[PDB]
């Protein structure tokens, strides 16, 4: 379709500079925008005027000292240091396409991203420059290497010193609402470049703002890798749309006790994290570290188990409000602060998204019927949807069904419009003309004492083309058991707790299962290998 958006939009000029201006005018006291701590005694805080000044300095470093021009792509690979926030704002101000990536990336990942994006610059931290420098020389478009570090390195520009020398006045580029602001690499096959516009990030953020329950004089802590689109949406835009403060902890180790201590030691009122953050915190006896100031707990990235919600309510007296989204769509469904929580449901449509469950032809289905979760993008493409996969309109096309952008997830919608996540459509198993969800099978296997962990996928079958296969991590108590007899026992066990057509006709015992950094089982990785 197409959009109904203002011609121009820029988050820095249209949002952040408002708050800076308000301070300058005495219309609001100097208010914290960014509070950073390293957990080792170093803290730093910018009010909105200082944030504006310092990010105008960043824009000047980038546009002036490094000569990056409007439309230039800037890889950003930083830990959780304030310079990530300054650099991203710097790019927004200067009209540069920022391309965030994780500080954990290896040189192969870096080479692929730099080459695929034809990035003209990389802004990197100490911890990744050795990896970058192994491959930087094979990226002919890469002209600028900006290092954020307390030290200098030959061949790298010293960002922090350049920042200090830069002018605090930068004329914000009058960016178009639909002009490219960022590229986030997915994994859809090989990683795709999801391009977002100034409006699909910033304007959408402005419209979503406060769904978390955050208010103007509050502090939000989003716990995120700086490379994840979560970081732009919730660490940067949500609080700043509201003129609230974003709290950032270096959090060099994902240390649940550091997290608890932090929540307990700072006046943090809202937090966002992946469900694993909450499950980890629940592995603590939270009771030595009360956090009475915390009011709002939100989560995205994985299904929030009803048990986790229950057990967080138990221990903290707080809700966890779930949200749902992907790189291409940002915040798609959420439980906002005023909405009742339905355990196992991820809420209702964002923000002028029309989210529906749709059938294989693209028709809206009635409540209670499983289909494909989609966002209506015809006749009008809503604000918040990405602009397309860069250099790949076919892959963008392939994900549109009728009037709908397919998220790739199955779902059901209840009577009040709440969505229940029913798994990745690509994880459904097609055996002997039956569709089989892996979750029921995995859940079945999990009831058995021998099974500590399991992942159920398709396996190519001689006789039936595709079969149900289970990878199982054994309880140590069953390591001694006969693999063949145990295999028949588990199948007998599944045949007997679910429709027998669902049972795993193959079982492989493994010592671990591949998982994301947020602890999600990577079934596609297992399925890939499993098909030669
Ligand atoms: C954890 C990791 C796999 C995240 O995956 P990603 O595709 O890069 O990030 P996205 O934000 O697009 O993932 C959103 C997906 O997570 C899932 N998701 C997000 N919020 C969810 C929620 N509340 N409930 C259930 N699933 C949710 C959905 O399946 C969603 O759809 P998608 O797979 O089409 O994208 C990680 O980025 C990674 O690179 N791991 C591999 C190494
Ligand atoms: Mg068990």
Curated annotation (Swiss-Prot):
EC class: ligase
Presence of the UniProt keyword Transit peptide in the record: yes
GO CC list: mitochondrial matrix; mitochondrion
Catalytic activity field: a medium-chain fatty acid + ATP + CoA = a medium-chain fatty acyl-CoA + AMP + diphosphate; benzoate + ATP + CoA = benzoyl-CoA + AMP + diphosphate; hexanoate + ATP + CoA = hexanoyl-CoA + AMP + diphosphate; butanoate + ATP + CoA = butanoyl-CoA + AMP + diphosphate
Binding site for CoA: 104, 432-434, 464, 495, 503-505
Residues where Phosphoserine is found: 476
Cofactor requirement: Mg(2+); Mn(2+)
Any one GO MF annotation of this record: medium-chain fatty acid-CoA ligase activity
Name by which UniProt lists this protein: Acyl-coenzyme A synthetase ACSM2A, mitochondrial
Biological source species: Homo sapiens
Gene: ACSM2A
């Amino acid at each position: 379709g197409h959009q109904e958006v203002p011609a121009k939009f820029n988050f820095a000029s249209d949002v952040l500079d408002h708050w800076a201006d308000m301070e300058k005018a005495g219309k609001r006291p100097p208010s914290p925008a960014l509070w950073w701590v390293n957990g080792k005694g170093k803290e730093l805080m910018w009010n909105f005027r200082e944030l504006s000044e310092n990010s105008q300095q960043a824009a000047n470093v980038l546009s002036g000292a490094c000569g990056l021009q409007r439309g230039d792509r800037v890889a950003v690979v930083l830990p959780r240091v304030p310079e990530w926030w300054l650099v991203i704002l710097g790019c927004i101000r200067a009209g540069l396409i920022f391309m965030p990536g994780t500080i954990q990336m290896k040189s192969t990942d870096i080479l692929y991203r730099l080459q695929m994006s034809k990035a003209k610059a990389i802004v990197a931290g100490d911890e990744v420059i050795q990896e970058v420098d192994t491959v930087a020389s094979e990226c002919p478009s890469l002209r600028i290497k900006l290092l954020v570090s307390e030290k200098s390195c030959d061949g790298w520009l010293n960002f922090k010193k350049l920042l200090n020398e830069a002018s605090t006045t930068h004329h914000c580029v009058e960016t178009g609402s639909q002009e490219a602001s960022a590229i986030y690499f997915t994994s859809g096959g090989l990683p795709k470049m999801a391009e977002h516009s100034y409006s699909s990030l910033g304007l959408k953020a402005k419209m979503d703002a406060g769904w978390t329950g955050l208010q103007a004089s509050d502090i939000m802590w989003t716990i995120s890798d700086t490379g994840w689109i979560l970081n732009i949406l919730c660490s940067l835009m949500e609080p700043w749309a509201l003129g609230a403060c974003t709290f950032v902890h270096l959090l060099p180790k994902f240390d649940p006790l550091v997290i608890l201590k932090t929540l307990s030691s700072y006046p943090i009122k809202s937090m966002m994290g992946a469900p694993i953050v909450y499950r980890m915190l629940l592995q603590q006896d939270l009771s030595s570290y009360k956090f009475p100031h915390l009011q709002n707990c939100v989560t995205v990235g994985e299904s929030l188990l009803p048990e986790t919600l229950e057990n967080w309510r138990a221990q903290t007296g707080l809700d966890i409000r779930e949200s749902y989204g992907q790189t291409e769509t940002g915040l798609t469904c959420m439980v906002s602060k005023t909405m009742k929580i339905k355990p196992g449901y991820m809420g209702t449509a964002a923000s002028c998204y029309d989210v529906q469950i749709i059938d294989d032809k693209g028709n809206v289905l009635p409540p209670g019927t499983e289909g494909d979760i989609g966002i209506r993008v015809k006749p009008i493409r809503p604000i918040g949807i990405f602009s397309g996969y860069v250099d790949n309109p076919d892959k963008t096309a392939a994900n549109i069904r009728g009037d709908f952008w397919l998220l790739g997830d199955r779902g059901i919608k209840d009577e009040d419009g709440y969505f229940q996540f029913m798994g990745r459509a690509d994880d459904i198993i097609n055996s002997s003309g039956y569709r089989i969800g892996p979750s029921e099978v995995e859940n079945a296997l999990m009831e058995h004492p021998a099974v500590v962990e399991t992942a159920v996928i398709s396996s190519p079958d001689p006789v039936r083309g595709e079969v149900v296969k289970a990878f199982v991590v054994l309880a140590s108590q069953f390591l001694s058991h006969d693999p063949e007899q145990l295999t028949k026992e588990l199948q007998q066990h599944v045949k007997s707790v679910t429709a027998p057509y669902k049972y795993p006709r193959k079982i492989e015992f493994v010592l671990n299962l591949p998982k994301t950094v947020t602890g999600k089982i990577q079934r596609a990785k297992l399925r890939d290998k499993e098909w030669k």
